[PDB]
Amino acid sequence: NYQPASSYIQPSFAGGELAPSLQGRVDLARYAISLKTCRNFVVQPYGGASNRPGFRFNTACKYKNYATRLIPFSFNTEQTYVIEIGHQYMRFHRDGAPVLDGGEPVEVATSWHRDDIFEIKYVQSADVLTLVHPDYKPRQLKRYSETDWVLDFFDNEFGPLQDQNVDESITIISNGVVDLVELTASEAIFSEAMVGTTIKLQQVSSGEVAAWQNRSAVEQGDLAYVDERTYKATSLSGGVDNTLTGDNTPAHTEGEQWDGPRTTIQGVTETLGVKWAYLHSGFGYVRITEHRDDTHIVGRVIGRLPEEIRTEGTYRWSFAAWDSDRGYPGTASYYQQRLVFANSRAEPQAFWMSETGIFNGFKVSFPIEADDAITFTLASRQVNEIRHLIPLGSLLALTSGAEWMISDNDQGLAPDTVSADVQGYRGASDVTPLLIGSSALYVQARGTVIRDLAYSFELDGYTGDDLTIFSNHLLKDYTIKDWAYAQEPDSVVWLVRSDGALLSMTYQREQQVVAWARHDTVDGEFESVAVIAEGSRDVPYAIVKRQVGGETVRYIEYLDSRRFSHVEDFFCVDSGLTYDGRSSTGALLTIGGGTNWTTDEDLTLTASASSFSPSDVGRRVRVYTGDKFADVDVDAYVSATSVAVSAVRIVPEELRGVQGDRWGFMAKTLTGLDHLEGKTVSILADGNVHAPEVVTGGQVTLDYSAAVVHVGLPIESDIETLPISSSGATVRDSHKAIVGVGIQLEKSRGVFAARSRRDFTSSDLIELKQRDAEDWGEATGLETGLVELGIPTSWDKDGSLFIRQSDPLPLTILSIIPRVVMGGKG
Amino acid sequence: PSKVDICNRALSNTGTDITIASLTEKSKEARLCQQWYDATLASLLRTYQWAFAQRRVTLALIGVGPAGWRHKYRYPTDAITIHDVFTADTYPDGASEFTDGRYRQIFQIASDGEGGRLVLANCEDAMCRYTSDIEDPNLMPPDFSTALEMMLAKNIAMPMTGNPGLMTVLAQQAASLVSDAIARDQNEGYRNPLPYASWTRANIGD
Amino acid sequence: PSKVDICNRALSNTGTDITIASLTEKSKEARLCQQWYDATLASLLRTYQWAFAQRRVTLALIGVGPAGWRHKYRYPTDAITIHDVFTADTYPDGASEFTDGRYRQIFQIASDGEGGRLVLANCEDAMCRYTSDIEDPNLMPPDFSTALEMMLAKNIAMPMTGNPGLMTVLAQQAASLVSDAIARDQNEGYRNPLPYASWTRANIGD
Amino acid sequence: TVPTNDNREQYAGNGATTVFPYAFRIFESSDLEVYLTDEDGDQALLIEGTDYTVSGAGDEEGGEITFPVSGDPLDDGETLTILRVIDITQETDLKNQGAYYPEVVEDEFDRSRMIDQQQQEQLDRA
Amino acid sequence: TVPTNDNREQYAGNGATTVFPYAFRIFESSDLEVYLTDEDGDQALLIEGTDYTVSGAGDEEGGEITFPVSGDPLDDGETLTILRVIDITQETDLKNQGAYYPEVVEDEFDRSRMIDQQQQEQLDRA
Amino acid sequence: TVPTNDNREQYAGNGATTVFPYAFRIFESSDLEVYLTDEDGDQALLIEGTDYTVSGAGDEEGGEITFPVSGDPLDDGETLTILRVIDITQETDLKNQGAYYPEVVEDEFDRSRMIDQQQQEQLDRA
């Protein structure tokens, strides 16, 4: 016989978590490159798997039992912030710390109700942020200082209006012509919801208005018109009985231009020339300010009403589209130097685009100039209320029934040339779409499904494919709550399941990588997630519900960095703080009074610039140099710079005389943990795991000195692979037995492994043994490369491994070599 | 060569390079080493009557044995096999001069039901020679140490690798080393030449 | 040659080439050198009563031996095998001329329980001939050295390589080498012709 | 660890008791000198797996012993005693040091402390 | 490091004496046991801090004590006995990924060595 | 390591033995307290070098003493007593060894076991 053990290397984990229903598709590469359980282990494009770094505790926000949300905001590339929105308030954050102002956070009072904040849709343009909501007036947010912020309303000058009232019977009569004027209508049309708007009144015609015959005698006050423009004379050149009009037709839309050179014309013996002040060109908007009845409203006139409404009364009135009853914009975006607002409550399937350049106006002119305002209405089939505009290759509109594309055909954007086309019928939820490459990720309507969107030179139309096909179990009986895209360290999409569970993507379309990963935190739930710039690393910010002290608190969270050349710099605790003290700012130390001794030797320590005080006596100071370190106790104060220190171990020879690159004191009692009051927090001191101690009173005592301590909630991370099976003549039915495992860790320490039996318990885990040189006092170092570890074996039919790490250390699995021996069938 | 040394030798014989360095640490090798090297010792001691593992103790009388056997003796606690049963009268000091097996008494092994094994014999106040549960590894010779390690590797290979053919080849090896050690222990000792014929002795006394 | 030389050429004969001086204290080959070099040296000493590794010391009496052995002595801690037990009188100077081994006293290997191995005997003031744990590489003849090399390389092949064929070929070479070593060791040293027939010696003396 | 000094228990057969739970760690079940003195004072040693079964061994919190397997529960006069006589011999290797588990050093320190405890107990007698 | 090898200091009674330097290292104040043998015989273990005092544990130097704190008769034939006593325990826990520090392991051995010291000293009384 | 309980040897003399093997590990010749017992029943502590020589020390297999360096062989009726007594001390520092040497801690732990072992041997005599 002598059939040796066999190895079945799995190069990648890019498949991510594989749904239980998918476990019978061995004929696909996903089965070969996926994992059945990947808790707290973010895949990596390259196909690795690294335990998620811990969430650093920033602070609690307010209103423990109220809703909250985060959005990303920027002040150009000068700085980035994180707005926090709750019940009728607003705060700011940066660098995982509150925006301090007088020892208190900066708050901007808001009107949004707590339940409605999640439906807020936002955009950004340089130093201006815009928030819209169907039930709230839009409020543009602008920043004037880090300690001074202002949230103003959106002033829609000549705001969008419905089509003119073709109902001829109803008419409106205005008492005055300029300034404070009282209106009157022949029907009950006005409402007390129009308290502040911008209505429009256009003259029926120029009845009771004199024409503009070429050469005529006029009076000091006239009201003549030429074409759609009513001018008023203000002066005459010669005598009142000797002045005529002239040939220069009035063409100005403002001013008082003449129409004759105040002189004779051959032999007409008149003096010619007449002033012509411009007046109402047919219409004038009235900004309503008061309500009296359904037939009586009062407002101020922006320009000037023609006298026809004063005397005859016009019928061509256009009520403003946006008010407090028909609704407000439900979504917004920018496009071709125009602001686009959409989804009013009364008129959902419509978007209004401002004129080119004037982001806060919606004027429309009679000649229909190209750069006037825009108004469209997507109808097609089914309800198609617009929810998301995104410029990808054109303005795209994602609606509840379809995914429209808006386009200018091929000439230009104008009220006449603007068109709209359908790209499919799948819908989209209210969740803000995400932007990745030349593709747009958008939640499919009704949640539970994630669809991407991009162009396709197969159908000449923006279309996409499902991303939840391989991990539907993670989302099917759940609904997505939020999103984010931390493209820089790893193209990961963080989203929240409405259960409080956080899931991650590893989306990279160019390399066909879609990896899912279920995450979790101890005694906690996730609420909202957003990412900002944060230097050179996209740092997500999350709202985490917790049950600290029998109360449902809400903390601010942000995912730490995976950058650490030494294990002591790692961070794998949820809502954990750091007590690092590796200060090297002009304070470089050197131990003197002898070299390379064995404690009890009266060794001298010196500092470059003070950095020592008599109160610091009895406190232990570490001195670093490269990787090596040493510990010495302060015994006496010789000077503010020079002191005597007693070693605790032999100072390593390569750490003598030469000036240590960095140093720092060590603490034993740690405070400021009231936010984790009464938790079984885990500790990590200088790359060494410390016994858990329950936070009592907000202080944690350590069993030894420690330069760097990371303290917080423990993290449970699990990997468990698919059962061994193959196509054709399968081996799934065959009995299997795994005896050893080659893992190929890289920059990792502390891997546990076992067999994935049904009765699996934490007590049978076998953990790796790595301590070869590892000098006294030095923590166990990082390990990179293949390591072969054996496990207790059984003869189950699952044939699945199980890798767990419950302690705060780095773990990174690049592959798996399960030492497998085949058995027999049933 | 201690417990740990023997198990490390055996583990490095199967093919695995890792040294267990203990008997109680948490790993498959440690529990395997413990749970097996106990039984491998217990059995390989019984395979042959090794000279270095020979004891001599007076048996403890219980009472009248079953039919035909005049006594029943409590089988020694730390015993693995009984070879010779005798009394001081059947074994006077210096009797090893004569190779004759006159000091071989009618003895049989049997059980009782209440407790452990029994030694049945007729001579009263009889001593015994037996292979004992050896505990000190410094008592062992190299060849037997290698036999121990080889047998242990054969016994623990299958959970460690899952290769039955590897168990077969280790069994063949362990048989070779066991035979070599048995032959050498035979050669490590000279009793005397065999006695003369029965008729000659019954004529001219030894 | 030295121990460092022996493992150097042995690792050369396992398949590696780089020297142990380039392997430092921390190395799998280093631990294998230490462990199996010591164990295999002990076994190779024991397999044969090699001539170059003999010594004769006077035993130390412990007490009255067990039933039928007039004395029990202690096993020389620097001994792996006893060949002959004898007194000064039974082997006077010049008695090696007659190859007839009249110098062979009744003896046997046993143990006590309180100490180490024991050598049972009847003659009083008896010395022994034994094989010692040779440690100086200067001592062993080149055949023994090469056999030790082959044995060490064979015995650490599997942990180093996991290659069954390598161990097979190295075990074949080790068996051949040790057989050649025994043959050459026998061929060195001529004592004398065998003694005459027993009855002839009884009739015409010796 | 070994947080307590307790290493011996002395139980007296009440007549209807078979549960004799102890309160110290045990490395391996084979290491338990279960003594029984009869109703005279003589010392008798019983064999594990013939007249008792220990359970819960290996656990840090003591364990339990199911003396006796058969027969009546221990009566008065007779006494059952529990002793943790730890083997007094080093059996952990460290020189080769392939991978160096810290747990082995902690474990062997625990063995040393248990040896010292048992010793202390038998030293108190003389 | 425990090189002193001794764990006992003795004194007699003559009055006019309040200092007794001990020749060994300790760790905490409770390690010291002092008795009061009566003039004609007997023994009397004292109550440590309540009646006598210390001069700081540790120091690897062999500090002293102070007694009588009250009036100072040593009651003629009455004698003293300074003894180092530690509960026979081991509490240091080493985790597999935990920290190895020379001080804690050396402290553990030290503990073991002074337990050996107590065992030897109490044995020598036998 | 030390898997052997024995540390004491007893060699009745016969007037011919010049070698006295001992089967246990010792680090230094300062161990092996040898008491020559004459027929009269006395005990006399021998002196290393002056009267006997310690060879083969260090190996786990044990060693032997050549006795006497000057005089007739150990006469009939006399008796020596090999007794490996390792002194009560923790000499081996660990705070100041720099690089990790597993042999150092292994040897110290062996030494602790041997001291507890000789304590056991003395306790058996009680």
mmCIF file of all heavy atoms in Angstrom, chain A residues 184-207:
data_model
loop_
_atom_site.group_PDB
_atom_site.id
_atom_site.type_symbol
_atom_site.label_atom_id
_atom_site.label_comp_id
_atom_site.label_asym_id
_atom_site.label_seq_id
_atom_site.Cartn_x
_atom_site.Cartn_y
_atom_site.Cartn_z
ATOM 1 N N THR A 184 -56.415 88.719 -5.695
ATOM 2 C CA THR A 184 -57.809 88.308 -5.615
ATOM 3 C C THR A 184 -58.097 87.384 -6.787
ATOM 4 O O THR A 184 -57.699 87.670 -7.917
ATOM 5 C CB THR A 184 -58.757 89.514 -5.643
ATOM 6 O OG1 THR A 184 -58.498 90.359 -4.516
ATOM 7 C CG2 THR A 184 -60.207 89.059 -5.603
ATOM 8 N N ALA A 185 -58.789 86.284 -6.510
ATOM 9 C CA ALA A 185 -59.112 85.295 -7.524
ATOM 10 C C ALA A 185 -60.610 85.044 -7.538
ATOM 11 O O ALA A 185 -61.288 85.175 -6.515
ATOM 12 C CB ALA A 185 -58.364 83.978 -7.285
ATOM 13 N N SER A 186 -61.123 84.677 -8.711
ATOM 14 C CA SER A 186 -62.542 84.412 -8.896
ATOM 15 C C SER A 186 -62.941 83.001 -8.484
ATOM 16 O O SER A 186 -64.057 82.571 -8.798
ATOM 17 C CB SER A 186 -62.938 84.659 -10.352
ATOM 18 O OG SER A 186 -62.525 83.585 -11.178
ATOM 19 N N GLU A 187 -62.063 82.277 -7.796
ATOM 20 C CA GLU A 187 -62.356 80.917 -7.369
ATOM 21 C C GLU A 187 -61.492 80.591 -6.161
ATOM 22 O O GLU A 187 -60.495 81.263 -5.887
ATOM 23 C CB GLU A 187 -62.108 79.908 -8.497
ATOM 24 C CG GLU A 187 -63.366 79.443 -9.219
ATOM 25 C CD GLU A 187 -64.233 78.525 -8.379
ATOM 26 O OE1 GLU A 187 -63.808 78.145 -7.267
ATOM 27 O OE2 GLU A 187 -65.343 78.178 -8.834
ATOM 28 N N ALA A 188 -61.890 79.547 -5.439
ATOM 29 C CA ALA A 188 -61.167 79.110 -4.245
ATOM 30 C C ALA A 188 -60.005 78.227 -4.679
ATOM 31 O O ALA A 188 -60.118 77.003 -4.764
ATOM 32 C CB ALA A 188 -62.099 78.378 -3.287
ATOM 33 N N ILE A 189 -58.866 78.860 -4.964
ATOM 34 C CA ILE A 189 -57.665 78.162 -5.397
ATOM 35 C C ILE A 189 -56.519 78.324 -4.407
ATOM 36 O O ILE A 189 -55.738 77.390 -4.199
ATOM 37 C CB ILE A 189 -57.231 78.613 -6.809
ATOM 38 C CG1 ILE A 189 -56.964 80.119 -6.846
ATOM 39 C CG2 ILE A 189 -58.283 78.227 -7.835
ATOM 40 C CD1 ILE A 189 -56.754 80.667 -8.240
ATOM 41 N N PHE A 190 -56.392 79.498 -3.795
ATOM 42 C CA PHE A 190 -55.269 79.757 -2.906
ATOM 43 C C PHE A 190 -55.360 78.901 -1.647
ATOM 44 O O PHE A 190 -56.446 78.525 -1.198
ATOM 45 C CB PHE A 190 -55.221 81.235 -2.527
ATOM 46 C CG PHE A 190 -55.137 82.157 -3.705
ATOM 47 C CD1 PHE A 190 -55.815 83.362 -3.708
ATOM 48 C CD2 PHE A 190 -54.376 81.821 -4.809
ATOM 49 C CE1 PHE A 190 -55.738 84.212 -4.791
ATOM 50 C CE2 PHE A 190 -54.296 82.666 -5.896
ATOM 51 C CZ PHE A 190 -54.976 83.863 -5.886
ATOM 52 N N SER A 191 -54.197 78.593 -1.081
ATOM 53 C CA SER A 191 -54.091 77.786 0.125
ATOM 54 C C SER A 191 -53.109 78.433 1.088
ATOM 55 O O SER A 191 -52.210 79.172 0.680
ATOM 56 C CB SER A 191 -53.635 76.358 -0.194
ATOM 57 O OG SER A 191 -52.228 76.243 -0.083
ATOM 58 N N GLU A 192 -53.288 78.147 2.377
ATOM 59 C CA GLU A 192 -52.367 78.677 3.379
ATOM 60 C C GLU A 192 -51.024 77.956 3.388
ATOM 61 O O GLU A 192 -50.175 78.253 4.235
ATOM 62 C CB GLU A 192 -53.006 78.617 4.767
ATOM 63 C CG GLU A 192 -52.538 79.717 5.715
ATOM 64 C CD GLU A 192 -53.587 80.099 6.745
ATOM 65 O OE1 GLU A 192 -54.647 80.627 6.348
ATOM 66 O OE2 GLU A 192 -53.349 79.875 7.950
ATOM 67 N N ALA A 193 -50.805 77.010 2.477
ATOM 68 C CA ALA A 193 -49.499 76.392 2.306
ATOM 69 C C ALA A 193 -48.588 77.193 1.391
ATOM 70 O O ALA A 193 -47.389 76.904 1.325
ATOM 71 C CB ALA A 193 -49.651 74.973 1.753
ATOM 72 N N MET A 194 -49.129 78.188 0.688
ATOM 73 C CA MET A 194 -48.361 79.042 -0.208
ATOM 74 C C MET A 194 -47.814 80.278 0.490
ATOM 75 O O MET A 194 -47.639 81.318 -0.157
ATOM 76 C CB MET A 194 -49.214 79.451 -1.409
ATOM 77 C CG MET A 194 -50.270 78.435 -1.801
ATOM 78 S SD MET A 194 -51.178 78.926 -3.278
ATOM 79 C CE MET A 194 -49.868 79.648 -4.258
ATOM 80 N N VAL A 195 -47.553 80.196 1.796
ATOM 81 C CA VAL A 195 -47.186 81.385 2.563
ATOM 82 C C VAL A 195 -45.939 82.040 1.979
ATOM 83 O O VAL A 195 -45.898 83.258 1.781
ATOM 84 C CB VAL A 195 -47.008 81.033 4.049
ATOM 85 C CG1 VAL A 195 -48.362 80.838 4.702
ATOM 86 C CG2 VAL A 195 -46.171 79.774 4.200
ATOM 87 N N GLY A 196 -44.905 81.250 1.703
ATOM 88 C CA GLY A 196 -43.783 81.769 0.946
ATOM 89 C C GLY A 196 -43.474 80.952 -0.291
ATOM 90 O O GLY A 196 -42.942 79.843 -0.193
ATOM 91 N N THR A 197 -43.785 81.498 -1.464
ATOM 92 C CA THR A 197 -43.522 80.856 -2.749
ATOM 93 C C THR A 197 -43.263 81.951 -3.776
ATOM 94 O O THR A 197 -42.987 83.102 -3.428
ATOM 95 C CB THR A 197 -44.670 79.952 -3.229
ATOM 96 O OG1 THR A 197 -45.608 80.728 -3.985
ATOM 97 C CG2 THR A 197 -45.390 79.249 -2.090
ATOM 98 N N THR A 198 -43.348 81.582 -5.054
ATOM 99 C CA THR A 198 -43.167 82.523 -6.159
ATOM 100 C C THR A 198 -44.154 82.149 -7.260
ATOM 101 O O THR A 198 -43.862 81.292 -8.097
ATOM 102 C CB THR A 198 -41.732 82.497 -6.670
ATOM 103 O OG1 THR A 198 -40.831 82.739 -5.581
ATOM 104 C CG2 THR A 198 -41.528 83.559 -7.733
ATOM 105 N N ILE A 199 -45.323 82.788 -7.254
ATOM 106 C CA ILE A 199 -46.319 82.581 -8.300
ATOM 107 C C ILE A 199 -45.963 83.455 -9.492
ATOM 108 O O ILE A 199 -45.115 84.347 -9.389
ATOM 109 C CB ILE A 199 -47.741 82.882 -7.798
ATOM 110 C CG1 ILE A 199 -47.825 84.305 -7.246
ATOM 111 C CG2 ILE A 199 -48.159 81.871 -6.748
ATOM 112 C CD1 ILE A 199 -48.533 85.277 -8.164
ATOM 113 N N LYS A 200 -46.604 83.205 -10.631
ATOM 114 C CA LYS A 200 -46.360 83.966 -11.846
ATOM 115 C C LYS A 200 -47.684 84.416 -12.440
ATOM 116 O O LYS A 200 -48.638 83.637 -12.511
ATOM 117 C CB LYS A 200 -45.581 83.138 -12.873
ATOM 118 C CG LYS A 200 -45.253 83.876 -14.159
ATOM 119 C CD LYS A 200 -44.546 82.961 -15.144
ATOM 120 C CE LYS A 200 -43.857 83.751 -16.241
ATOM 121 N NZ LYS A 200 -43.311 82.857 -17.298
ATOM 122 N N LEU A 201 -47.736 85.674 -12.866
ATOM 123 C CA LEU A 201 -48.915 86.240 -13.510
ATOM 124 C C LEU A 201 -48.484 86.886 -14.815
ATOM 125 O O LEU A 201 -47.709 87.848 -14.804
ATOM 126 C CB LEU A 201 -49.606 87.264 -12.606
ATOM 127 C CG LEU A 201 -50.073 86.765 -11.240
ATOM 128 C CD1 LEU A 201 -50.583 87.917 -10.397
ATOM 129 C CD2 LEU A 201 -51.148 85.715 -11.406
ATOM 130 N N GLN A 202 -48.984 86.365 -15.932
ATOM 131 C CA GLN A 202 -48.657 86.878 -17.253
ATOM 132 C C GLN A 202 -49.890 87.515 -17.874
ATOM 133 O O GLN A 202 -51.001 86.994 -17.744
ATOM 134 C CB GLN A 202 -48.125 85.774 -18.169
ATOM 135 C CG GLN A 202 -47.440 86.301 -19.417
ATOM 136 C CD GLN A 202 -47.405 85.287 -20.539
ATOM 137 O OE1 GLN A 202 -46.952 84.159 -20.356
ATOM 138 N NE2 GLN A 202 -47.888 85.684 -21.710
ATOM 139 N N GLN A 203 -49.683 88.644 -18.548
ATOM 140 C CA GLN A 203 -50.791 89.364 -19.159
ATOM 141 C C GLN A 203 -51.442 88.521 -20.249
ATOM 142 O O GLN A 203 -50.782 87.728 -20.925
ATOM 143 C CB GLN A 203 -50.303 90.696 -19.731
ATOM 144 C CG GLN A 203 -49.813 90.629 -21.169
ATOM 145 C CD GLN A 203 -49.331 91.969 -21.690
ATOM 146 O OE1 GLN A 203 -50.043 92.972 -21.617
ATOM 147 N NE2 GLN A 203 -48.115 91.993 -22.220
ATOM 148 N N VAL A 204 -52.759 88.673 -20.393
ATOM 149 C CA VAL A 204 -53.465 87.994 -21.475
ATOM 150 C C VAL A 204 -53.027 88.554 -22.819
ATOM 151 O O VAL A 204 -52.747 87.805 -23.761
ATOM 152 C CB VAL A 204 -54.987 88.117 -21.282
ATOM 153 C CG1 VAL A 204 -55.711 87.110 -22.154
ATOM 154 C CG2 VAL A 204 -55.351 87.931 -19.822
ATOM 155 N N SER A 205 -52.952 89.871 -22.922
ATOM 156 C CA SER A 205 -52.545 90.569 -24.137
ATOM 157 C C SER A 205 -52.237 92.007 -23.742
ATOM 158 O O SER A 205 -52.234 92.352 -22.553
ATOM 159 C CB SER A 205 -53.627 90.487 -25.214
ATOM 160 O OG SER A 205 -54.581 91.522 -25.051
ATOM 161 N N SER A 206 -51.983 92.857 -24.736
ATOM 162 C CA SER A 206 -51.729 94.270 -24.492
ATOM 163 C C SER A 206 -52.974 95.125 -24.679
ATOM 164 O O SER A 206 -52.881 96.249 -25.188
ATOM 165 C CB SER A 206 -50.593 94.771 -25.385
ATOM 166 O OG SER A 206 -50.875 94.567 -26.756
ATOM 167 N N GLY A 207 -54.144 94.606 -24.313
ATOM 168 C CA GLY A 207 -55.345 95.421 -24.358
ATOM 169 C C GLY A 207 -55.218 96.635 -23.454
ATOM 170 O O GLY A 207 -54.599 96.578 -22.389
#
